[PDB]
């Protein structure tokens, strides 16, 4: 594990620490949850998605190499990964006990019914929950977790990328750092084909992204529901 690689991990950890509040105190600022009137959860969860986008931006800005990229690339990458990083980062609150995201209290505890009350069908939700279960099972070190989130964001593969070779070279430094960290600082059996399983999660996310996009197009089809979102959410997903 090189010194440049040690440094890269320390940065991502702190970057994550600074963008992910495990007490979820800001949640009081959101429009309230309503669990009774379909789409009752749309205003609370939109606010949460919106907040989460900002925190992913703040995280992304600190990825070593991310600043060297052009503004338009920066745009393209955040736009297309946002929902994925939110799915990934939400794994920290996801609990297998009852297949729910537990953000510190019952008010901020989300389940299938809740995500449903925000206009989403099982075509998304069921594989989203399966995704969370298989990610939780990997039992990642926080270091692998923050590297995965960074690799997801810096993908040369995203449509509309100008400098695909630069994005790739940056992704590579992170891949290598993650490949090397698994070998070093994950003990077996936890480290068995662990990189391959991580990269696979990355493919599941694309699939989840596609589904979210289509269910987003359909939801934001009625201007009545589209007006329940936030400006950042309209700009990023819009």
């Amino acid at each position: 594990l090189s010194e440049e690689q040690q440094h890269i991990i320390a940065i991502l950890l702190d970057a994550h620490h600074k963008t992910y509040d495990p007490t979820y105190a800001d949640f009081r600022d959101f429009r309230p949850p309503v669990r009774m009137s379909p789409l009752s959860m749309l205003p609370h969860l939109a606010d949460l998605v919106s907040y989460s986008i900002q925190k992913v931006i703040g995280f992304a800005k600190m990825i070593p190499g991310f600043r060297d990229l052009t503004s338009d690339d920066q745009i393209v990458l955040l736009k297309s990964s946002a929902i994925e990083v939110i799915m990934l980062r939400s794994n920290q609150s996801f609990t297998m006990d009852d297949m729910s995201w537990d953000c510190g209290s019952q008010d901020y505890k989300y389940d299938v019914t809740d995500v449903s009350k925000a206009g989403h069908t099982l075509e998304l939700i069921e594989p989203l929950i399966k995704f969370q279960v298989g990610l939780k099972k990997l039992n990642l070190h926080e270091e692998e977790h923050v590297l995965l989130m960074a690799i997801c964001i810096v993908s040369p593969d995203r449509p509309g990328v100008q400098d695909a070779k630069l994005v790739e070279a940056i992704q590579d430094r992170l891949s290598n750092t993650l490949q090397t960290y698994i070998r070093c600082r994950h003990p077996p059996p936890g480290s068995h084909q662990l990189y391959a399983k991580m990269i696979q999660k990355l493919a599941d996310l694309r699939s989840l992204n596609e589904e979210h996009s289509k269910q987003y197009r359909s939801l934001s089809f009625q201007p009545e529901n589209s007006m329940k979102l936030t400006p950042l959410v309209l700009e990023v997903f819009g």
Binding site: I57, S71, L78, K79
Partner: peptide
Amino acid sequence: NHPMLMNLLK
């Protein structure tokens, strides 16, 4: 076309 995303990145 994304002024809010830009301001957050700057």
